[PDB]
């Protein structure tokens, strides 16, 4: 009986005469993600091996169950995530094999040197990722993923704009509590920092963060912790309002109620731009030329496609979960006219 959590894995092996093991695509907390020939269907696949771990083993059976319950939908929206082939048990872990697909989004920004993809490549990105959002909120599914980030939206095929949701490993269904911290810091909803309840919004927030930096190349809200993230959040869309911040349990983390009953900034132990000074309008330079300027004189950067893109955008990043704006309505937005 081995004596890590980690299964040893040989670049060239083969698993029960029909897996040859190529490489490693990525280590994560779960465990590992290895590219593997299935010679039996005569197709490349992403083998995810499960650590012997009981957290990570309890984690992934939920993930096989949502995956599954998924599957047995018709609508073709349900392409926009990834397709699991089969799940079994290997050498003491359980293994899930999923279709082979290709780089995420955070490297598709790092090949662009961070500069950012353009506005109609972002539309694209938009409009499959609102589609895959519809799908989670189907009813009978009611699914938060609790983890969307540029790591886990996978191109398809590395020449082509399709793409596909990956991790349902931190995912729950609607009205459960099941993880003390969810969802990326720099992904985060304010409803997740503030202690209060949270739905299927907290995953059109983390989108609406996606698809700004997607465009600009850099995170919108990159904080170094809890406090330096409400405090970023802060700097662009200013103060959440009274109704959310009186009712919120962790409230007085980030924030003090004043005498008459408004709310401000928690002083520091002893540097942010005051509240909403950090304009979205120039953070996207709708007026002046996109990003640092560098997409004036391309087309399809007009100051009436920046607009559209800025509006939907702040639809996305509402403070209140119940008026921010839902899949269903995101779809009908002019920027997808
Ligand atoms: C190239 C490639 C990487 C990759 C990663 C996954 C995957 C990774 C994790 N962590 N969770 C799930 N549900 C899927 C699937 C296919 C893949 O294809």
Same mark, same amino acid.
């Given at each position: ?89 290997? #050498? ?55 983890? @969307? ?27 459960? #509590? ?6 990326? #810091? ?20 983390? @989108? ?86 560098? #997409? ?42």
């Amino acid at each position: 009986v081995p004596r890590g959590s980690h299964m040893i894995v040989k670049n060239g092996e083969k698993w029960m005469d029909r897996y040859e093991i190529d490489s490693l695509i990525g280590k994560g907390s779960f465990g590992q993600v290895v590219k593997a020939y299935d010679r039996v269907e005569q197709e490349w696949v992403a083998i995810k091996i499960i650590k012997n771990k009981k957290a990570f083993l309890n984690q992934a059976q939920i993930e096989v169950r949502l995956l599954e319950l998924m599957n047995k939908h018709d609508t073709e929206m349900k392409y926009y995530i990834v397709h699991l082939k089969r799940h079994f048990m290997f #050498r003491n872990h359980l293994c899930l094999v999923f279709e082979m697909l290709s780089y995420n989004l955070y490297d598709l920004l790092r090949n662009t040197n961070f500069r950012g993809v353009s506005l109609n490549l972002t539309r694209k990105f938009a409009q499959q990722m609102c589609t895959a959002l519809l799908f989670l909120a189907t009813p009978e599914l009611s699914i938060i993923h609790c983890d @969307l980030k540029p790591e886990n939206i996978l191109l398809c095929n590395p020449k082509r704009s399709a793409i596909k949701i990956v991790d349902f490993g931190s995912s729950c269904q609607l009205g459960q #509590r099941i993880y003390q911290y969810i969802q990326s #810091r720099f992904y985060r909803s304010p409803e997740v920092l503030l202690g209060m309840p949270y739905d299927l919004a907290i995953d059109m927030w983390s @989108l609406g963060c996606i698809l700004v930096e997607m465009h600009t190349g850099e995170p919108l809200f990159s904080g170094a912790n809890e406090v330096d993230q409400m405090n970023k959040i802060v700097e662009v869309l200013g103060i959440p309002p009274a109704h959310i911040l009186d009712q919120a349990p962790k409230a007085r983390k980030f924030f003090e109620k004043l005498p008459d009953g408004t709310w401000n900034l928690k002083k520091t132990k002893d540097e942010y731009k005051p509240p909403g000074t950090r304009k979205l309008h120039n953070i996207l330079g709708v007026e002046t030329g996109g990003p640092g300027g560098r #997409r004036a004189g391309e087309s399809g950067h007009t100051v009436a496609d920046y607009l559209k893109f800025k509006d939907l955008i702040l639809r996305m990043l509402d403070y209140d979960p119940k008026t921010r704006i839902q899949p269903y309505y995101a779809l009908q937005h002019s920027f997808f006219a």
